Design a binder for these strands. Structure first.
Lengths: 167, 156, 281
RNA sequence: AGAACACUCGUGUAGAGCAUAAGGACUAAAGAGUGCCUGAGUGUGAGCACUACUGCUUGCAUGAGGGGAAACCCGGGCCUAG
RNA sequence: AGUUACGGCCAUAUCUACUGAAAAACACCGGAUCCCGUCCGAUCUCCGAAGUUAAGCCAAUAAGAGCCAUGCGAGUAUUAAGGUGGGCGACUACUUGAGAAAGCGUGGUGCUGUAGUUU
């Protein structure tokens, strides 16, 4: 087969949303354990009385992982979801996402004062050369040859983890 | 009633042309100016320092003094039925070199040859004046190939 | 939404060519080149430094109406004449190229014998010798590259200064600067003569000899060792200052015009369309 | 977790913003962020708006001046009123 | 003859699909010890050559969209001067002069400056 032209992970995005006070600190400590990083707190775009959100108030924390560490977390999570995904979960862009309701399934000890949180996982796939669209000098749009398509993303998932993609 | 600020009535003037927005081109900055040249004012709305008053837009004058990034130009104006000279300060982004002397300078180059020979051989130059177009010329015609014209088109 | 209607295309204004290509910053260029109307006969020279995956380029350029004129040029790939075997995009190779560039200039102007070289022993700007002709003057053009402490663009710039050209600079940008203390110049000298890489080579042989072979294969092929670098670089600098490279020859590669493709005639284009209708019916 | 919560990928000539009328101006910015500073210095000339008051443009000299690697810029507020 | 570095005039150069490419370059590419900067060596900064023409850059193709030119529209629309011209008016004929636009047809699809490198 032709080298280059082979799929990889470029990014895994993790986010927890918990609008309020000390809850965000309690949450942040979790992300700081699952990955060796300090996560970025994010703030409310609008003011929404019903949801209990003032504008410019912190509401969530996220962290982005790349390289080897990404492989461990993704394997750890797809197990929790028992290798089962729906055709809804894949985009026209070569990316996919799922959710988890209970952080303790990723293995960490309980500590009853910390609490129970869920988490979103989102995954972005790639082929070499993407740098052409991100570098400062001579920045250009990539060729259709080097994108990742909806079918390819499913094929990669099936191959790599032996999972089942339901219609 | 109308008002009397410094940029009154300049909605049409002092606006960019279609598909020509943005800052000036390099040629604007690399042009060298000298005292005594004739120069022509056209304001660039994107530059906010060294703008002249809108009366002077599209007028041509003569350079009196040259500074780091601006020029002083002499103009004449009628006020209270008398002639007044005016000294206008302009930044180099709002001016272009005038073409108004072009033909005269060519004519001077021809005169400069003749006026030397006129000392050696003649006594006075022929001086090569322009003349307005004269009467219609004479013509000799072969008289085959005649074309007739008629009110054939009825124009309902 | 946008690109769905004709009016989008009809009303659109294109950026200048070198902006579409992301090669030039026009706001920076204009501040750098704009003429002073009172200093007639001033003819500012830019020192242009650019770094490619393969090589370092120094050019000395004067901006004239109609197009920029190149006074002189030097490239790290030419240092192969003086026996440089390795690291053509290294911090040392940046410095060496700036040094080379300066000498070629001062030879043309015949200032070469007046303004002598000086290998990296102070951080002052070049100063006009009394009773002789003034130093050649230039200003640095770094393009779209970022300014930060220890960027390779500034190495070439110090090369040129050490070579005899007058550039104004502040020492804030060199390794060995301190926020509120004197300049530690041994750190600067260290990098110029390649200590930074020797120290990496030495580390890897203790850590992982497999990774060492992967990281430094080209060096191994030349039998260079960490110990050899100072002698290598001292020789390289001296030779630049001492010798001169042979002139280039001109040749007509005209015959390679065979490879150029040519556009279809109208007559062909029409027949091709005609055939396409008939193939369809 | 809903019409409307946070995070992403692709398109995106301005359909946004620019405290305060209306017009003009602005796109690797003049918009949004981040760093440092108090030039919202000091003497003294020449001019533009129908030109007194007022507002602005610009010259030369100085500061144990500022910001920036530097070219450059700054004696209030992007320009036209307070 | 191309490319590459720095440019000039700023779409004949744009936008969308497809296809080609000797040499040398230009790139993608392999790491983070240091200098430097990130939630994140993705970007920026540094140190490298195991791979690859798939991408970009360059070039061709398309009764392509858009842009540029020219012919026609057309002596048409409008307009300066004039008369004891006409009309209740609204407005309009004539005499000596100046003179368009949209649409629609046909052709084009970057040109050049200084230096470097490659039969």
């Amino acid at each position: 087969e032709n080298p280059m032209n082979k799929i990889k992970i470029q990014k895994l995005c993790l986010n927890i949303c918990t609008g309020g006070g000390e809850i965000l600190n309690k949450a942040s400590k979790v992300l700081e354990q699952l990955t060796g990083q300090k996560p970025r707190l994010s703030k409310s775009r609008l003011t929404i009385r019903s949801f209990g959100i003032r504008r410019n108030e912190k509401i969530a924390c996220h962290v982005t992982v790349r390289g080897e560490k990404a492989m461990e977390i993704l394997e750890k999570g797809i197990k929790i979801k028992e290798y089962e995904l729906i055709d809804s979960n894949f985009s026209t862009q070569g990316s996919f996402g799922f959710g988890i309701k209970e952080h303790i399934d990723m293995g960490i000890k309980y500590e009853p004062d910390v609490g129970i949180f869920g988490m979103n996982f989102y995954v972005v796939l790639e082929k070499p050369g993407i740098r052409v669209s991100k570098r400062k000098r001579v920045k250009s749009r990539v060729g259709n040859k080097q994108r990742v398509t909806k079918d390819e993303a499913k094929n990669w998932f099936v191959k790599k983890y032996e999972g089942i993609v339901l219609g | 009633v109308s008002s009397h600020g410094y940029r009154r009535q300049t909605r049409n003037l002092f606006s960019q042309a279609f598909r020509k927005h943005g800052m000036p081109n390099t040629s604007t900055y690399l042009t060298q100016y000298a005292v005594g040249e004739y120069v022509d004012i056209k304001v660039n709305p994107a530059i906010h320092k060294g703008m002249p008053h809108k009366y002077y837009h599209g007028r041509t004058g003569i350079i009196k003094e040259v500074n780091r990034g601006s020029v002083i130009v002499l103009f004449n104006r009628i006020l209270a039925n008398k002639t007044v000279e005016r000294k206008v300060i302009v930044g180099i982004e709002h001016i272009r070199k005038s073409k108004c002397q072009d033909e005269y300078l060519k004519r001077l180059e021809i005169n400069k040859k003749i006026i030397e020979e006129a000392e050696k051989k003649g006594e006075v130059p022929v001086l090569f004046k322009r003349q307005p177009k004269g009467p219609k010329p004479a013509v000799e015609m072969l008289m085959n190939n005649i074309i007739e014209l008629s009110y054939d088109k009825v124009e309902s | 939404d946008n690109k769905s209607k004709k009016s989008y295309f009809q009303r659109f204004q294109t950026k200048k060519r070198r902006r579409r290509l992301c090669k030039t910053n026009y706001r920076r260029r204009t501040k750098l080149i704009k003429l002073d109307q009172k200093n007639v006969g001033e003819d500012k020279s830019r020192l242009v430094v650019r770094i490619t995956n393969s090589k370092v380029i120094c050019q000395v350029v004067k901006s004239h109406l109609g197009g920029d004129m190149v006074v002189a040029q030097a490239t790290s790939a030419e240092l192969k004449e003086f026996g440089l075997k390795v690291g053509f995009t290294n911090y040392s190779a940046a410095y060496a190229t700036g040094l080379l560039c300066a000498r070629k200039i001062l030879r043309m102007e015949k200032l070469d014998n007046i303004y002598k070289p000086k290998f990296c022993t102070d951080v002052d700007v070049v100063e006009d010798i009394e009773g002789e002709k003034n130093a050649y003057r230039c200003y640095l053009d770094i393009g779209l590259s970022r300014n930060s402490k220890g960027a390779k663009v500034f190495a070439a710039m110090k090369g040129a200064s050490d070579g005899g050209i007058k550039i104004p600079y502040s020492p804030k940008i060199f390794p060995g600067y301190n926020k509120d203390e004197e300049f530690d110049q041994q750190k600067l000298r260290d990098r110029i003569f390649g200590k930074e890489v020797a120290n990496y080579m030495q580390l890897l042989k203790k850590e992982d000899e497999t990774k060492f072979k992967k990281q430094f294969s080209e060096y191994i092929k030349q039998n260079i060792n960490a110990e050899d670098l100072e002698k290598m670089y001292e020789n390289l600098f001296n030779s630049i200052v001492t010798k001169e490279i042979s002139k280039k020859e001109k040749k007509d590669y005209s015959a390679l015009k065979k490879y150029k493709v040519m556009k279809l005639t109208k007559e062909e284009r029409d027949a091709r369309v005609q055939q396409k209708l008939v193939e369809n019916n």
